[PDB]
Design a protein around this nucleic acid. Sequence first.
RNA 1: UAAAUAUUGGCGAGAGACCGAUAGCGAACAAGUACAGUGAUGGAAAGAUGAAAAGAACUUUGAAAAGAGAGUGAAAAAGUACGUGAAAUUGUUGAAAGGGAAGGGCAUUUGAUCAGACAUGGGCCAGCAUCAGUUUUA
RNA 2: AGGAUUGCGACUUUUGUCAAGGAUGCUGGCGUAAUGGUUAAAUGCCGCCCGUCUUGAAACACGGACCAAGGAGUCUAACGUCUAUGCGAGUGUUUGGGUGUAAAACCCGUACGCGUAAUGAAAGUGAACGUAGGUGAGGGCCCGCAAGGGUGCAUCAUCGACCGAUCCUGAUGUCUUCGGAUGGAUUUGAGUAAGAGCAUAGCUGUUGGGACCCGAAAGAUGGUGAACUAUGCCUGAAUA
RNA 3: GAAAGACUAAUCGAACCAUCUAGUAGCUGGUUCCUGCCGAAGUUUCCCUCAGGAUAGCAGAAGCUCGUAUCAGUUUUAUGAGGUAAAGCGAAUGAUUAGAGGUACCGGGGUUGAAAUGACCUUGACCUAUUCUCAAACUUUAAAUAUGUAAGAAGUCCUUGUUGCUUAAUUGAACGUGGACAUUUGAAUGAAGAGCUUUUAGUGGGCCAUUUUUGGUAAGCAGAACUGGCGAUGCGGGAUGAACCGAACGUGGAGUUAAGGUGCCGGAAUACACGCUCAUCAGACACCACAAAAGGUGUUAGUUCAUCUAGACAGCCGGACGGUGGCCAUGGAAGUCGGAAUCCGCUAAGGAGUGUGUAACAACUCACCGGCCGAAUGAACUAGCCCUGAAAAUGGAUGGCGCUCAAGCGUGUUACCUAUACUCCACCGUCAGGGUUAAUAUGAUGCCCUGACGAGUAGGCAGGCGUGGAGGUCAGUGACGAAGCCUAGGCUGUAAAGCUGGGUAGAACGGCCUCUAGUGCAGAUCUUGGUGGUAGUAGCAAAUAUUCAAAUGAGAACUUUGAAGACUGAAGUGGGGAAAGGUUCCACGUCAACAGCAGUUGGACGUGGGUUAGUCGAUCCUAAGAGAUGGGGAAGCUCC
RNA 4: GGACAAGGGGAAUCUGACUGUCUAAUUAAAACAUAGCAUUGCGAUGGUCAGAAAGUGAUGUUGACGCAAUGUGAUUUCUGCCCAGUGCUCUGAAUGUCAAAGUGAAGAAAUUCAACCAAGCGCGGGUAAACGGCGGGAGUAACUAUGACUCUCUUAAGGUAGCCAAAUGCCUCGUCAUCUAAUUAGUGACGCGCAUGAAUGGAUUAACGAGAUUCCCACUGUCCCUAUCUACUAUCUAGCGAAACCACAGCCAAGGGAACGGGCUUGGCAGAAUCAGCGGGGAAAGAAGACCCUGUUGAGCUUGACUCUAGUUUGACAUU
RNA 5: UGUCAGGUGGGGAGUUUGGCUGGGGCGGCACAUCUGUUAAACGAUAACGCAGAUGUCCUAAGGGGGACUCAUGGAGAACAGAAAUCUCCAGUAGAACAAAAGGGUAAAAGUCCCCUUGAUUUUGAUUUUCAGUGUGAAUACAAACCAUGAAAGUGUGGCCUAUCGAUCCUUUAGGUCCUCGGAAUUUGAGGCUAGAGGUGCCAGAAAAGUUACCACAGGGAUAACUGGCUUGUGGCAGUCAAGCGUUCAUAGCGACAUUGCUUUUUGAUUCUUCGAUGUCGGCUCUUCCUAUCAUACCGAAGCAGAAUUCGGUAAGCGUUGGAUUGUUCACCCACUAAUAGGGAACGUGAGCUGGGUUUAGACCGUCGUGAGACAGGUUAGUUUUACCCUACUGAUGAAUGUUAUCGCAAUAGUAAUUGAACUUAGUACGAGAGGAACAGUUCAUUCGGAUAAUUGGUUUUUGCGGCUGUCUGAUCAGGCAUUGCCGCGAAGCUACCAUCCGCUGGAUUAUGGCUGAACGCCUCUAAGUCAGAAUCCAUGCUAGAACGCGAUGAUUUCUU
RNA 6: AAACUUUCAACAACGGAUCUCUUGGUUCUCGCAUCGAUGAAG
Length: 57
Amino acid sequence: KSKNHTAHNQTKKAHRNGIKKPKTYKYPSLKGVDAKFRRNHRFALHGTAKALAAKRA
RNA sequence: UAAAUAUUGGCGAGAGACCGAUAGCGAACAAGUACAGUGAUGGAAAGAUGAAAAGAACUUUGAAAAGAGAGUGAAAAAGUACGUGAAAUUGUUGAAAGGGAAGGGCAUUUGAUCAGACAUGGGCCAGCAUCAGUUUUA
RNA sequence: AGGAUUGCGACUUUUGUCAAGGAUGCUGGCGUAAUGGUUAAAUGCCGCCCGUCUUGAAACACGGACCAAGGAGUCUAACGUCUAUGCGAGUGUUUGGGUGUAAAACCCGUACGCGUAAUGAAAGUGAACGUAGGUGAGGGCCCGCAAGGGUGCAUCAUCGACCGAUCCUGAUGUCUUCGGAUGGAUUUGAGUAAGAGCAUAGCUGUUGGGACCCGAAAGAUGGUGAACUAUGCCUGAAUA
RNA sequence: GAAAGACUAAUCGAACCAUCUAGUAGCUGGUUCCUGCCGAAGUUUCCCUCAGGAUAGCAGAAGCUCGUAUCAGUUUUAUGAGGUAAAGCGAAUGAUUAGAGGUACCGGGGUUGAAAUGACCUUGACCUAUUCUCAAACUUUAAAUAUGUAAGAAGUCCUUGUUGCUUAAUUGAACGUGGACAUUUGAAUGAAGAGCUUUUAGUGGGCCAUUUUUGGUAAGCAGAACUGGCGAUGCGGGAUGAACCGAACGUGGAGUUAAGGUGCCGGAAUACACGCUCAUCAGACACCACAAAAGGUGUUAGUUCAUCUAGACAGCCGGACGGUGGCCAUGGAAGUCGGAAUCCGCUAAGGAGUGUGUAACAACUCACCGGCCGAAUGAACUAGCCCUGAAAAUGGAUGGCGCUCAAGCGUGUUACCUAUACUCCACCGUCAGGGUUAAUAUGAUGCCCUGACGAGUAGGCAGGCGUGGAGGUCAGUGACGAAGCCUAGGCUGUAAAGCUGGGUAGAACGGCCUCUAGUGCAGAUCUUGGUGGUAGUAGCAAAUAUUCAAAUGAGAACUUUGAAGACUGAAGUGGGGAAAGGUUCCACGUCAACAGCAGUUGGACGUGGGUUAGUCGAUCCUAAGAGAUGGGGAAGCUCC
RNA sequence: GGACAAGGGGAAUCUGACUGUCUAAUUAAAACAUAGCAUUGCGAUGGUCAGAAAGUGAUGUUGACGCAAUGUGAUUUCUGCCCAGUGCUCUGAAUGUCAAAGUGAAGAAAUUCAACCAAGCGCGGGUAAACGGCGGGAGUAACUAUGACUCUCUUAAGGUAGCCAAAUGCCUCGUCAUCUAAUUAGUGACGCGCAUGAAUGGAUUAACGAGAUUCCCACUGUCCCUAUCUACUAUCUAGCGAAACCACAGCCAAGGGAACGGGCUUGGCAGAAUCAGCGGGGAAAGAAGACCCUGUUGAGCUUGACUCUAGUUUGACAUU
RNA sequence: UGUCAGGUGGGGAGUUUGGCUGGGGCGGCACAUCUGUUAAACGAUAACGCAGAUGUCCUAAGGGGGACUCAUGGAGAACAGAAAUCUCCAGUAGAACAAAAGGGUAAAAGUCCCCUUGAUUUUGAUUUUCAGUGUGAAUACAAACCAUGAAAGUGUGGCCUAUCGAUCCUUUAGGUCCUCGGAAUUUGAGGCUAGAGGUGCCAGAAAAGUUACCACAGGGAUAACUGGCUUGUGGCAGUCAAGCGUUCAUAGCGACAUUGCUUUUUGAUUCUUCGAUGUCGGCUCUUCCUAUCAUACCGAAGCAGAAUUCGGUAAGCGUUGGAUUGUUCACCCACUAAUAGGGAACGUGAGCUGGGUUUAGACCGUCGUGAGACAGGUUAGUUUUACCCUACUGAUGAAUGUUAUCGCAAUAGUAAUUGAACUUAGUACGAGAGGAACAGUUCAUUCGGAUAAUUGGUUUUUGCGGCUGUCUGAUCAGGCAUUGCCGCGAAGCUACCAUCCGCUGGAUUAUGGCUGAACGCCUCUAAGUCAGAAUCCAUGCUAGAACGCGAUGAUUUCUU
RNA sequence: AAACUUUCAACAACGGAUCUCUUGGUUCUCGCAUCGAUGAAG
């Protein structure tokens, strides 16, 4: 007796509000990245902080 | 074993941004009355003439009720079927229309009726000419 | 349409003139029911009866004979976002006391609620390596004639630091089994990082309440009926 | 309960009376004043979910950080992915028609000397090269249309820092320090400002159209895909119609067109040009309201083939034999039951023969050729409009009348009619972008300028109109007339409404700034009260029956008296009581209502009068029953 | 029997014996009752039944020729077979199971694990005028049906006497005979009978029946075929005077449309005001469909549905 | 007797007794999942669409390394054979891989041989269904600890796509852990971190029937009656023509194929109506359709005549009486000119009937433990209201100067019907048997309009006469018996139960002809034209427009 | 042409809305404790 499924006035609804791109940023989210790489990457950024501090003198 | 605490009942006093007679208690009036049911119980409607009854003497028509006059009063378009007296709904008179309904909207014509700055000394309705804006036709 | 002038122009020998940022000039009739307004009828064309549930109503779908008055999202206890007001690391007088022109207005302060610290089931412990850290963007201001450089609040992204839990590591010491130094980890929190909240009032939304208004077949507690009719007992009557 | 779920005070498959109770409802019906701006959904996932909720989506409101940004339901250049339409089977997988060859090593049936470790037959057994047709769940190959990424300052290269990662390493990899290159911000077009956050309404039954498409004989049937509509939407056209064609709407004026039309109804050519059709059932405009196979010398055009200086068809006559009865067959076949031969002569021409006919001949007749006559005819086909095929029920529908070298059908060329669409001007509102008290009176909320837009149910927000009370203020209005009510009088506002003339009537009531609510009605088989049409209508008909005079009275079909007719017929319309009523009995007065006509009468209305017991009843005794006490239960009302 | 008053009759079939009784206001019967027949329980400290409880009740002013609880339904005549299943019952054999209290062992105690164990269920016997079933399913063959032997499926047994297309038979309007001109009817026979059958009573049957059904005699306006008469209405007048219903109203055909218009569209047409009749329409009035489906709405009845319970019965402790 | 424990206990109490669904119910699972396709060349995508699978099996069929090639065919080897084992040649997979189906794999992911437990531990990130929640599965690393190989490497179960499960409760593993809040010690209980015990309605209540005695709230979101769309099925008709028909396709028939029409069969569907449109037949009455049974007039025949068969224009006119059944339909017995088929809300219930279906009473059989059920059989069972509007049938009537006579006819309606006898004639025709017709006479059938002299019926003429019972004293003469009964009975009314009456011209259809082109002939025809049928139109009959007309008669006092 | 039907106005009917009034209600606060065998409530 009842109607099952349809896709009428569905794409028409979506284009009213937007259909938008996902923004994008500089410095993306560093998640799901290799753990061995990240540990060494932390020590590199710690060491280079000492370098720039000594230069400004 | 007192006090600070309770109280839609009873007796006595104050108030209200509460209702205004289809409201407010069921009940502003002879209301738990009239009335219904065998019985437990059920349960209405109904306020207002005028300051004062001064509540209409007397004539005349009628078997009488009443009617016409008169008289009271500021008023009887206040007469105890009573302040004001709306609508549905009815009678009379006046105006209009009517060949299987009426009743509406736009625009005129005729018939009715009605506002609005010519008064001081004794505005309304058109026509022609030269221009501007938009068009049409040789 | 507009209602002093301002502009662009053109023609001018020149002054000025002009069709150039929206109509001026001249003339006649009437000055009132004539023009207009409402109202009734006639004529041309057009017009199905509202309210409602529905994909769909003029409907052979439901409610409506007619009129008057009454008649339906209200108030409260906890609350959320937004907005106005007062004070602001605080805020809130009104349980209660003092006073009074007496349910008012005015004054008073111990407490107590929320906020100022979190995270763990709990025992418990408990937020600065550095200008409260770097990088990218950033309004505004500063220097400069400009090009450009300097300083960069709010906020957004991003990698670090700190506090708690979790899992390892286990220093000097020491009731020899307590104690937890320091260093770490693809884990983890409604955290810290120069505080924002508390009180009153308003629209809208939420949950309990009769809960926008009317509407069941039922269920439960405590009572009244055998003058009708069902059946038995006692005592009478009636049938050519 | 002699049994039917019967009866139990009009109530029974579980009585009635109050209270808990305003019981609960995913279900039905109703839900009260105006303009202004924006404007939906019937879909995804879960649910004792399918008439219902949550969750996302769509919508409004409030805005915040910024001011041409790194954006777009689009195109182009560069570059990826796909297995549909078509295509293919002498290409796999599976299906399938017809021969030919190789046969050879072989499985078999025969025929040939029972013969065959031998031939030739149908043969398989496959094989070899060919040939006809196929496929949603087969494929080598392979479009269109849709679809992913890129077209730069977060850029391209040069330098040298950082470490516990990585390297044989002085390598690499990430994140950097300083440096070079801005006209030419390194395709097109547009930009109505861009990005972001909170919060909450309605909705969660959908339906129709053009293509794609599954089930089904098919359906105004069921079910999907992509855009567009209706629902929420008027306006011009399709006669009429939710959806089709054209177009989307503030209030008016002038022009011009869309779709569709121009004999009349009806505004606009009884225009112009070339054809076709005549129907005793003509035809007439998309979706749309129907028609087919098969046929016609009705008429119109065309294709392919034939004969033509006598056509040849006509269309009327002349011939149609000689060998010959050809061989064969057998009762007999002589052109004519048949099986094959198909040849000559004379020839203008005559088949060893088209049929009729006969037992077989005879006889007739064509094929082919002359005789008469003098210019185009014969066959087979294709499509146009008309006709046959074509039968349903009340009378009937190209919208109607009517139309025939059309007012019909096909095609062309011009004019003309006309929508709320398009262009231009007036006025209204909403939104945006500006300019301004620099003393310079009257509202800075002011006073101006410029530009765009206007449909709308469910829904949300904004700005106003009115009703009952409260605080303030106009030293407001009023018995010289407040409130209310009536009025084919007038004025203002888009409107909710407000102000005011005339009449009626006789005590209170308004404006402006704020507070507050039992604050606006046409619907609910709404509640209470009142009044209509229907209508002076339905009807006032069962118990056999009334009539004549006289009196009283305003008045007599109906009261009182007389006379005459009648009935009940003593199980009665007679004479007395029981239950039950309660003054109805009786007298005098008297008719406003009641006695469904009337009324002088009355069981009506007003004012009085009336029931006398030692013996008649009650009182007294006991019946079926009821019911204290002594006792025993029960928290107790009270029970035995 | 001159008015008045006053039985129609006959031959059958189904069914209940009869007289009697009930659904008050749609069912008067074939239903219920009944005499007769049969079964079950009880010797008073008892059976059946009431009450919240009692030093309390009904049967009972009773005592088995009685009281209580059921089935069948006068007389004549018969009541066949089957205790596997489901009930009921027993002086059946036990130890298969099986509560609290008590008994013992372990432990520091709370607890724990052991045997021991009442009725009642399991195990065995009895019972069909207890509830019920009494079917077929296969085959062997004498002769061209033959009815004697075997087994065994759902458990135990396999329809005996009887009766029938019967109120019990689907296929059907069965086949044969009879009644009629003609019979889906009626009666009489036949019977592997979907699904007859023995006190859940079978077969028969005199009298009786506002019971159901078929035919024959007499009788007739039921009918061919209608006609006429009488009273009381209707009709007209005087007086009195309502209700239902009602958006607005009232002429048709076709079209399209929520697919059957009184209003929209195109045609036909169209003349004040009215009175008797009548039943074609107004999808005419009556009543928020009783049939059907939905609702996470109910109630009445039933049962090896789920969870309880009064009563009763067995055991332990107290009264002791 | 009291308290506690075990059995029994529909005697009574409370409550439930799924969902989807071309109505529901019975079936089935489309209700958690997986393969191919439908699905329209990215992804997404429906139906109780199509072909099929799963609730498991495995210490090896898991993990690593090393050997080696399978289907099938051909040629050879004692028993040995189409098929045992042995050897060589060809061999792109045509095999095998735990199962459904698709993909994948050849010094392997197949087959055989050696060693083992990566089916291990601690936790997060990530794809797929998706609210970007959970459940299930799958992918890529970090820190560990192992296996295997000379190593590089590979391995966090099954080559890949399926093979499974919250809260609360119970239970097991783990730790020199935390808590029992007056302080301690041992038992005991409660916590923190990961497994197991299951919800198949699979995001997860704990649950049997029946109601014909029924109830409420709703639903045309949804069945039973019409109507509409559709036509498979039912019914009626075409096309081509192998054969049948002694001979001969089409006088009449007609296989194998194929195009249609119709809504009087039955299905399909669910748009209208559930705050009700009164559902089966019969009785009564009107009108419409033609797909014609009869009658009128014609054509064809395997038509001699009679009878019959096929077709044409035709709906003018007619279509019956009975037995059985509730019947529609059916089947018989007759008659007849003939006993054709249908529609109108499956015409017709405020028109009737109530036998049927269809409520409650009751009986029988089969089924059910039981209440009860049965598209089985049987018997008894309630049929309301018109006074309104239109419609039809009759009847009055204002107003056109007033009144009265005598007429015309617009339009509407219309009617006649069929047979038998005598004669023609026992003639035509025919071997016979049989056996017509036109004209001409007389009568009937069904239908219609009047009429009452006669016959019949009716009798309140209460006209006359008779008879009972009672009442008025008797006799005479009467009353009552709801018109007392009985016989005769005028007037009126009335009956195929009685009598009379019911017209004749024109134009056409089918069809058959004349003259005659097209097409030098022929031809019923194209132009023109003769006959012709129950058809049509007049004549005749019925009403007379109340808004259609005409002709004629008389037209008002002396208060003025 | 009248009657009849429908719409409006003036006067007259029907009926009791509207407007103004009010010895009654309703809520809140404050004070006090008094039935009966001497025969109460009803």
